[PDB]
Ligand binder design. Sequence first.
Ligand SMILES: Nc1ncnc2c1ncn2[C@@H]1O[C@H](COP(=O)(O)OP(=O)(O)OP(O)(O)=S)[C@@H](O)[C@H]1O
Ligand SMILES: Nc1ncnc2c1ncn2[C@@H]1O[C@H](COP(=O)(O)OP(=O)(O)OP(O)(O)=S)[C@@H](O)[C@H]1O
Ligand SMILES: Nc1ncnc2c1ncn2[C@@H]1O[C@H](COP(=O)(O)OP(=O)(O)OP(O)(O)=S)[C@@H](O)[C@H]1O
Ligand SMILES: [Mg+2]
Ligand SMILES: [Mg+2]
Ligand SMILES: [Mg+2]
Lengths: 432, 432, 432, 432
Amino acid sequence: MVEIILSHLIFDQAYFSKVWPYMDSEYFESGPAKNTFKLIKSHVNEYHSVPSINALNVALENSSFTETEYSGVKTLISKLADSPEDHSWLVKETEKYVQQRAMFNATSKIIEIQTNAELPPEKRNKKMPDVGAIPDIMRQALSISFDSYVGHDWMDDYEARWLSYMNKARKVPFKLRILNKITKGGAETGTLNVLMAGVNVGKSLGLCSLAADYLQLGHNVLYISMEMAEEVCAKRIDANMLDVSLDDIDDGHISYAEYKGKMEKWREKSTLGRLIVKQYPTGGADANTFRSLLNELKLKKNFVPTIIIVDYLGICKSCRIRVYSENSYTTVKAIAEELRALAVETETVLWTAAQVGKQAWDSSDVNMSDIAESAGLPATADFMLAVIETEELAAAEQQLIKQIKSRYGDKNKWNKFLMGVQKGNQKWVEIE
Amino acid sequence: MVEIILSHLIFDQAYFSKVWPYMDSEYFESGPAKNTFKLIKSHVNEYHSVPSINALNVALENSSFTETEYSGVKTLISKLADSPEDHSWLVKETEKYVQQRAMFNATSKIIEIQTNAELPPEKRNKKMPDVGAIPDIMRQALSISFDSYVGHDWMDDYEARWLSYMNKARKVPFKLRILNKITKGGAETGTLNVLMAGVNVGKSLGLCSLAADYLQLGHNVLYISMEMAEEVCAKRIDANMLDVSLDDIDDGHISYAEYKGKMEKWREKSTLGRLIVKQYPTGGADANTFRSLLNELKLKKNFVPTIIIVDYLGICKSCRIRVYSENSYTTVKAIAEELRALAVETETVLWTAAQVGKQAWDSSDVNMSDIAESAGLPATADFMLAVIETEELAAAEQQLIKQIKSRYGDKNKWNKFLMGVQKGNQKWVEIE
Amino acid sequence: MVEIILSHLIFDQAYFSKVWPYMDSEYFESGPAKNTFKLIKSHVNEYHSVPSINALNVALENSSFTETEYSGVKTLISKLADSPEDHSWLVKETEKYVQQRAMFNATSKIIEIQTNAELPPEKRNKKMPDVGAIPDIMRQALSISFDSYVGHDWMDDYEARWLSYMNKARKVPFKLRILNKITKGGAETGTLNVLMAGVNVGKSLGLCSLAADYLQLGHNVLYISMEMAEEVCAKRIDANMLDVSLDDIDDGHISYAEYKGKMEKWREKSTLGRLIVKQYPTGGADANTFRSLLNELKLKKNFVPTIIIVDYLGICKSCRIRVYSENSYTTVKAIAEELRALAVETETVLWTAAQVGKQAWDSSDVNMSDIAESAGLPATADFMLAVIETEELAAAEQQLIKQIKSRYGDKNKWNKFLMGVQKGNQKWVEIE
Amino acid sequence: MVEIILSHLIFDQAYFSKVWPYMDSEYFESGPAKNTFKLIKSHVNEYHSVPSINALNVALENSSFTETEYSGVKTLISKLADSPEDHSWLVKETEKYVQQRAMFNATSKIIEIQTNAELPPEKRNKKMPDVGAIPDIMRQALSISFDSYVGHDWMDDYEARWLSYMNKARKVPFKLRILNKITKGGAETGTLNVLMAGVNVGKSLGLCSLAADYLQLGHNVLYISMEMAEEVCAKRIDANMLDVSLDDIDDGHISYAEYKGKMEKWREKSTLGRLIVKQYPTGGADANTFRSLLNELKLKKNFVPTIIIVDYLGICKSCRIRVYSENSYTTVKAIAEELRALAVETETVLWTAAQVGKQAWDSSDVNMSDIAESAGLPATADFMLAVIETEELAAAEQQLIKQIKSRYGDKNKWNKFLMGVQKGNQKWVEIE
DNA sequence: TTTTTTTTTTTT
Ligand SMILES: Nc1ncnc2c1ncn2[C@@H]1O[C@H](COP(=O)(O)OP(=O)(O)OP(O)(O)=S)[C@@H](O)[C@H]1O
Ligand SMILES: Nc1ncnc2c1ncn2[C@@H]1O[C@H](COP(=O)(O)OP(=O)(O)OP(O)(O)=S)[C@@H](O)[C@H]1O
Ligand SMILES: Nc1ncnc2c1ncn2[C@@H]1O[C@H](COP(=O)(O)OP(=O)(O)OP(O)(O)=S)[C@@H](O)[C@H]1O
Ligand SMILES: [Mg+2]
Ligand SMILES: [Mg+2]
Ligand SMILES: [Mg+2]
């Protein structure tokens, strides 16, 4: 019903006020319709008013159109008329038409993406999204509607604000009381949590400490390690939970009898979850691979995680961008968005560990202008912490957390606090 | 376009009074259009009024034209309608048509001058202007504009300027008597105004107080927050407007009945504006994202603001610098310039806040030299109010407001004044 | 490649044990391929074993098909052979085929959903899902990778993990007691180890000392020089092994007999290994050249090196990135990743040097931030030691070695230790 | 015999091991042969194994070339079949075929370069090499003989190594005793030695003194000046050799009789080489230019230098990086590496000058970190000497030479000694 | 959009 839409854009005002901000040139066929809409949009952009028939016939004459295009536009303009109908069926019909056009465009785009992917390298188009980006596009098209929320309107959105006042989101508590204090009860389900740190300063130590703490609380924890072997991460967890140093395990100070006894003592406890460590090669795993892993864990082991942990965000595959196509910032932002989408879909608290820039290394204080790969990670993330064990905290067997971005509470309340990192047992103890 | 021009010369008054002095016979054609315009001009010269269709036909009957000219003029006269187009588009389009025709005539004239110049000197026309007159002729073609407004012309716009001083066309009052006293009637449109907060003063309390005061005066306020969510800023706004303490909302002392009653009481009042709160991540909002936000609000929400309040200048990002620093002087200077450019181009009062220098923190008196942003903020800021909160003032629930830069009026007239800050309701009350 | 898939399903148990878990009739075709796979699936369901050609033909006789389908199935069944192709290529190709067929089916399904949505509610089928099911449908078709391994469990696999604790075959001792002490048993196979210092401090001296120490332990050492000639580095190795001097070799203080005697005495030792020195022009080699060099070395001589020393990573040339395609942070990190991949493929200890920026060329200490090339090298590295020499140290002939990145052990247990570097002999001497 | 080569690449493991490392895509054809080899090479790079006929067919079906190419590749693959053969006839025939194809490609590229250089500029299709590197390409066409040198074995090849210590043909002695003492016999051929002084401290006086000293010791010296005329450098050499001050030549205190007598007295001495001075405009000479100069010197003037001197490397042009494309670091490092490559190619002692940073000027000490244009120059230079002059040293007619990078010996020993530079005679004298 | 060299400048 393109002709009706154009006719009521020209000859009606309430319809124009209701539907114009959502109309786009891509919703019209490449014939007379798109060119007529181009003329209307140019006139509105230049004069901030709805053009008349004379205005468009003047705009058509002052246009660089071929004979076929000129004839089609003139015929379409001649065919326009103000058919009296109701301003409740027109709006819904226009919304349906726009949604259908958006779905059609998305389908064509994903077909083109799949055709582009199968092409051999050095011939395939670049900057075109890969196959893994197909669902996201299909998520955007279904979101088209003639209702748009731009900002929070005082006196117009106050019931929702009162609900936000009275209601509080559910929280997965930590085992460290300081994190609960700074997060008002823990972390929410569909979140992307990042623990940035320098190189060789405790990115995996903190993640393994969190994994052990969550495992002792009865959660199903999935540790996806992209840099370390499964046995290494499981040895970190064992050191955390069996109270044996990594030096003792490697040197063989502990015997198999004591190890088995401690493992069985932990097994007999009812307040214990299941921790599963999966190793992927560097750059060999993405969000879709994680979803396949979750599906096989559910089907073959009856395992549904809650505390999915990714060792390093910067190593994982983009899943939306082809490898070595965009810059580090865009690729890491895409990875963060994909991981947060996975966390929201699976209702799992997702924890990761990015790397800070070379400047932040051995720096007593860090800020958001220290992230190495991408500064867009805080925007995508829901809670971001830092590690500041630079020069003298190591001698005192301590650490420091900056709280760069905390969406659960206020970052400027307990911004910097001291953590008792114990590297032999790979754990965090509190200074209290 | 000529048909529209002639029709709206015949059947309009404002268009005629606006475009008649810039209308010439040579601008139309060498056929029916020129003859019709000659008839119109002859009628308006003999009778100083716009001719009617019957009078035009009578003049055409009593005129010296051949058969083809008679047919063309009759058809064109029969093809003129009193249709109603918008005035701005009509004036702009007829101006463009006149300019194009004048340029074509001048180019043809200079080509004819050049052709006559390359002719035997014994054999040439004397009336044709010499070649040296070519640059001037084109100038007369370029000096064709229905309305000349290039800047403010002294001695030529003194009557309009006086209407600005009497009507205070630029001032926006403050709702606080002291702030109106030192600004000679409030802040001005197209200005950047900042608050300098010493140690122990919040930057968002004063901004929320100003936003509430503007809201109570009927102004559309756009509050862009960086370090806080939309709900938190709107909660500060509610605290100030509903007289409820900030902690009372979190505790639950105020019930839904009182909240809704107060909100509907405010909604009943016709002297209330609209407040739109938009949240952006730290460092993820330059003064080009604000332009997009304004465009979206105007197109979708029809919300065109008169007050724009940015939560914190330091948290913002300089679009030109691109690189971002937590506390760098070059970025603050660029951010201030970009925000003031936005205020000027949008004709809105723009408010922001900054932290004073550490020396300014310790000293109750704050010097422009004692500012974290030196030569960057006291150079791009029309007004820079300084807020001092010492122990004695806090014990008395007061803050010392000092005026550090006042483009509006004399800085030393009323430099120091005590403000009744309420930290619970986030409000500024005057002191007798 | 349906014929290959079916042939290796029937005639290969290893292929059947990794692909049958993930296989459906929708993946193959709508003609003879689907019918053949349906026969195979029916036979394996009725009898839990892979069918044979005779059994498949008997089942085809028992099953009922139309004439065309019967002929197609007979023709396809006739075309099955063992054809022992590579397992890795076969599984990768069948994974690709399954993924592409699943994507095609998902696209057709969403197109059918969209077509059914446009139908009137009376005409539309209730079995097809709504448009809201379009995204997840496209997502479940992107999570069909072939991977049955779920990973460690920490409670169901602690016996295997303890057995893995006893697998110390990855460790390679250092011949220096301090290095073994700080590495908890020496370096590990398939790791990128770096020895960084300033210009003219002894990086190649340390590399040659490590080469000699590994040679005296019976290892095969491959020294790849990027600046010096083969005979020059071999002179340093001779100075380390024969233990006379560098100048005495060039000053004639060693007669040919003594040289012959010492070389033959070292030949008589059964604890000595093999050392090959290879030189490359600056910026002309990487793992691609190194892999061909490894293959040529293995073919020409019974030499599979356990230790691979690269004179400098920076002088090396990246495989994919051109000579000056991108900046240092990229291509240097790319070369580091390629070298680590080569080491983990060959299961060899990889040693290389790194340069330090000018800021730490005359400093008593050097940090990880003082890496002249990309900071991604101290991300792919595993044991990045650092060599610091001052005037006081050079007076005592004692270079200081600082533990910069220690992945094997605790980086701060023995952070700084003094060595006994003898520059004339190109040897590192432990200090007791 | 491309079919045989491909067939035995497929059906012969022994053949593939030797021929593959050398096979390249530019040795077969522009049609079916190249496409088949590209398929095989892609399969080998993806799976590290020789593809089978089924694998080749599968890759052919998943390929994007047209119908003609597809049919040609299919026919070629169908024609591939193993035949009873012998390893030797095949390896020798393959070597002959590869050499012939390399020669054919080389001569085609030579013709293309000749027909491209004979074109008007700005239309010469840049990125094509100039005529200067016409023979070098041919030299690459002859260095393909299936006989890659694996490397040098420490124990297997030590008689050849020992017959390189008393040879001493690599070292070229100085004339000053201190420089010989610190370098333990003088500089070595195929090296890059550098003087760092600053601006107007020396650094060309030292180069001229070295040139004169080498010339007196029966050497052919090639001075290359990028910033001075051929007569200024020759005047400096005349002042050095004839023991006549530059002021005396300027002021005419030396007669033609004395000049002629001294020149003839030098000529009649047998212990004297030939010095040739060549001038190039600043930034208008590179390694290829120097090689062309060497060739034309050998042919036209039968002059074979051994002590090639370049006045300043920083003033030369890189032969690989486009001008002003990369920063100073990369460009200067590349220039120094190319100069060292030239020196090792022609087996000459290469001497050069380098500037220091602005901070090192008028300083009593110059460190290695004070190098001006690149930190890579010290890393890619065999020997560097820093020339330091203060007011006290200038008043004493002495300069302090500090050993900054001493690759021929220990720099800690004799790090700073005082030369007796005489600026009038452009000569260095010792103080011993 | 980050990254790294070198320089030059300026601000604190
Ligand atoms: N086997 C070990 N025994 C004792 N301490 C260890 C051992 N391995 C590592 N550590 C310590 O643990 C610290 C943190 O190491 P990681 O957990 O790997 O941090 P990291 O950020 O993951 O390092 P990356 O991934 O290489 S950037 C190191 O700095 C060491 O001090
Ligand atoms: N014609 C001359 N007569 C006498 N002394 C001279 C003459 N030319 C140069 N000198 C001296 O030689 C010193 C060093 O000369 P150079 O070798 O040209 O210095 P330089 O470092 O090569 O110059 P740049 O900046 O590198 S091009 C100067 O400082 C003068 O004292
Ligand atoms: N022929 C020699 N005789 C004695 N000492 C030497 C000799 N060559 C080098 N040295 C010493 O070796 C030290 C550093 O050796 P190098 O291996 O050259 O250091 P490096 O520059 O980091 O390694 P490169 O650049 O890859 S050769 C110097 O400071 C000298 O003291
Ligand atoms: Mg880690
Ligand atoms: Mg070096
Ligand atoms: Mg000079």
